[PDB]
């Protein structure tokens, strides 16, 4: 598709200003190529990075790597925010950054889109904190906000 194409690895790592990192905002449409990596988890002291694409997002099987202090719905987490439509396939890896684990109600919001195709994001690897296993879902546990993507937990 038209717009930018990312095949490398980009690391997102802004410093708390003063409590939370400034989002990195990129204009236009983005295609994340198969060997592409967008990595937000580069510092456990600055969890809460945000990558914002002011346009559409097309995945060709690249990877988004996020960190989260995994607990309940209010977990501190890195996030991807897409102003437009998400299509294709982007894999999502999430690393626990000192979370204890907890049961979610509706889920931890990690990705927001204007709209997403089915399986636009696909989990890669297990996501575990304490005795809880986390899974990627389009929309919340109860089916709300299906343009957003969540992590829901269950006892492991």
Curated annotation (Swiss-Prot):
List the subcellular locations: Secreted; Cell surface
**Taxonomy, superkingdom:** Bacteria
Give me the ranges of the annotated region Autochaperone domain: 50-151
- The protein here is known as IcsA alpha domain
Q: What taxonomic ancestry is recorded?
A: Bacteria, Pseudomonadati, Pseudomonadota, Gammaproteobacteria, Enterobacterales
Gene name for this UniProt entry = icsA
Instruction: Give the fragment's position in the full-length protein.
Output: 591 to 740 of 1102
């Amino acid at each position: 598709p038209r717009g930018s194409h990312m095949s490398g690895t980009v690391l997102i790592n802004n410093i708390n200003a003063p409590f939370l990192p400034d989002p990195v905002i990129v204009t236009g449409n983005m295609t994340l190529e198969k060997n592409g990596h967008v990595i937000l988890n580069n510092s456990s002291s600055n969890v809460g990075q945000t990558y914002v694409q002011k346009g559409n997002w097309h995945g060709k099987g690249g990877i988004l790597s996020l960190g989260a202090v995994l607990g309940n719905d209010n977990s501190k987490t890195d996030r991807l925010e897409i102003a437009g439509h998400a299509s294709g396939i982007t894999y999502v890896a999430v690393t626990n950054e000192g979370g204890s684990g907890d049961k979610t109600l509706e889920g931890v919001q990690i990705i927001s889109t204007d709209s997403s195709d089915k399986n636009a994001f696909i989990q890669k690897g297990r996501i575990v904190a304490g005795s809880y296993d986390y899974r990627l879902k389009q929309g919340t546990a109860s089916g709300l906000n299906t343009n957003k993507w969540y992590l829901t937990s269950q006892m492991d």
